[PDB]
Amino acid sequence: GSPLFHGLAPEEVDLALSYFQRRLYPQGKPIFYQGDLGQALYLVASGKVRLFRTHLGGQERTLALLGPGELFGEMSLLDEGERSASAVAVEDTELLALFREDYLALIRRLPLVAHNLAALLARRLREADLELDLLSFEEARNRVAYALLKLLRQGLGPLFQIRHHELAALAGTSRETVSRVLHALAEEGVVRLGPGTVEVREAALLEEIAFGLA
Amino acid sequence: SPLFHGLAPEEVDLALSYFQRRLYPQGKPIFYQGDLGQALYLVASGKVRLFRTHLGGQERTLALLGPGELFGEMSLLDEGERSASAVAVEDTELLALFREDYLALIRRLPLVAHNLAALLARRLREADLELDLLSFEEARNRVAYALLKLLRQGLGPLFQIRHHELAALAGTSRETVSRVLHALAEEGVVRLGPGTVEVREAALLEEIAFGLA
Ligand SMILES: Nc1ncnc2c1ncn2[C@@H]1O[C@@H]2COP(=O)(O)O[C@H]2[C@H]1O
Ligand SMILES: Nc1ncnc2c1ncn2[C@@H]1O[C@@H]2COP(=O)(O)O[C@H]2[C@H]1O
Numbered sequence: 001g002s003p004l005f006h007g008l009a010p011e012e013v014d015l016a017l018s019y020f021q022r023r024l025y026p027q028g029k030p031i032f033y034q035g036d037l038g039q040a041l042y043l044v045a046s047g048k049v050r051l052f053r054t055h056l057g058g059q060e061r062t063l064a065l066l067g068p069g070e071l072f073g074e075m076s077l078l079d080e081g082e083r084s085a086s087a088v089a090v091e092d093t094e095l096l097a098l099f100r101e102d103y104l105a106l107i108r109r110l111p112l113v114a115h116n117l118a119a120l121l122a123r124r125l126r127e128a129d130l131e132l133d134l135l136s137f138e139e140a141r142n143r144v145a146y147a148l149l150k151l152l153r154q155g156l157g158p159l160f161q162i163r164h165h166e167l168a169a170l171a172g173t174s175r176e177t178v179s180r181v182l183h184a185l186a187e188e189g190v191v192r193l194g195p196g197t198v199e200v201r202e203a204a205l206l207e208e209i210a211f212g213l214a
Numbered sequence: 215s216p217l218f219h220g221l222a223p224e225e226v227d228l229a230l231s232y233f234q235r236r237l238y239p240q241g242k243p244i245f246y247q248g249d250l251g252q253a254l255y256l257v258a259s260g261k262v263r264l265f266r267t268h269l270g271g272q273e274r275t276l277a278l279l280g281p282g283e284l285f286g287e288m289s290l291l292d293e294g295e296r297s298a299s300a301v302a303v304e305d306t307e308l309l310a311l312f313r314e315d316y317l318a319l320i321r322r323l324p325l326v327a328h329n330l331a332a333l334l335a336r337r338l339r340e341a342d343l344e345l346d347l348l349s350f351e352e353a354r355n356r357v358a359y360a361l362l363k364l365l366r367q368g369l370g371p372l373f374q375i376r377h378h379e380l381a382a383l384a385g386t387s388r389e390t391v392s393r394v395l396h397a398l399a400e401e402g403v404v405r406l407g408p409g410t411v412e413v414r415e416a417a418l419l420e421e422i423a424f425g426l427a
């Protein structure tokens with residue numbers, strides 16, 4: 001069941017599908033490219049589609065693998081801007097295409113289709129905010145160790161009155177990952193934790209961990 | 215207001231009747247990040263600052279919005295949290311559209327829902343452009359970190375090293391490394407030659423390696 005059709009009665013789904021046109025793309029055929037003039041969105045009826053952007057001397061960053069029921073190409077449909085990504089068939093693929101003029105007449109009968117596009121884009125923007133904030137545990141570990149190292153280097157230590165959040169601000173990670181890292185560092189016997197305190201036990205081992213050789 | 219793009223003048227009037235006026239004197243919070251929002255807003259008068267909390271308790275400012283501009287559409291659409299905080303920076307008048315009234319409105323003026331999808335489409339374009347940049351930014355930290363490790367393993371400050379060697383060390387591609395190295399060189403952090411990378415500014419390099427500079 002396509003999210004584009006969420007909320008619609010069975011008859012209304014049938015109604016909506018009647019505005020679409022069938023388009024076929026064999027394995028490995030480009031559907032469209034980033035920067036192309038676009039006048040339609042696509043539902044995947046069968047097969048598999050890959051979306052990707054190109055940058056950095058022609059390198060590709062994959063954004064999505066889409067199977068049956070999934071939607072793409074709605075941005076050029078909506079704003080008449082160029083395609084924001086390339087789309088290639090990775091299997092023999094059947095696409096149901098909805099052109100801009102047919103879309104305009106459809107939402108006049110079923111506004112919930114326009115709203116469903118809005119919601120999908122909202123879902124995607126949320127996934128994008130997450131990708132901004134994301135970092136591997138391993139690198140988080142180095143960065144948190146380095147932050148602790150920085151406190152060691154003020155010449156007092158090795159016991160610190162410090163909240164996980166102040167350490168997170170120091171390291172540039174979230175409070176949650178700082179706690180995750182500190183619990184792993186305590187399990188390794190590198191630090192000892194208490195109510196509002198972090199005590200470094202193994203400073204040399206910590207310094208090793210900060211610089212990623214441990 | 216672009217939310218009403220394409221509407222006849224009497225349709226704009228009809229659309230505006232679904233909104234509700236809310237007043238916010240200067241410095242008053244309109245909503246916080248994490249709130250379960252039930253409405254989107256238009257600025258009728260005044261000025262709103264949108265800002266997001268980015269790890270540690272700090273706030274990146276997203277925009278300053280004046281008359282005619284729209285915000286708070288996310289929670290309206292998906293019923294999830296506000297992804298930013300909004301505060302009045304002047305005495306402000308807002309037109310608010312609650313979810314049940316939004317649903318009734320687009321049933322009557324479908325172009326409004328279209329105009330909203332179109333706007334989110336513009337923001338997603340901007341976001342992809344930013345995410346292209348994130349790949350490179352993360353690469354720049356990881357490349358710095360790789361060189362930093364060579365420096366701390368005793369080597370340097372001049373390294374005999376090929377780009378592909380660095381790429382293996384940093385978990386990136388050769389092309390990206392070449393680009394990262396060119397930027398660090400313009401930043402004065404390293405100096406390059408045939409098969410060589412020289413660290414000029416070890417402390418700066420260290421900061422870059424941990425995502426601090
Ligand atoms: N960040 C993203 N995540 C998932 N899909 C996207 C993203 N950005 C663009 N797309 C899709 O890729 C399509 C490429 O062409 P369009 O811009 O017409 O519409 C685009 C969206 O359907
Ligand atoms: N990156 C961004 N750029 C511009 N505006 C944004 C950005 N992120 C969030 N917003 C706006 O800030 C609002 C805060 O509440 P919502 O998430 O409901 O809807 C959000 C958008 O209107």
Ligand SMILES: [Mg+2]
Binds near residue numbers: 315
């Ligand atoms: Mg009402």
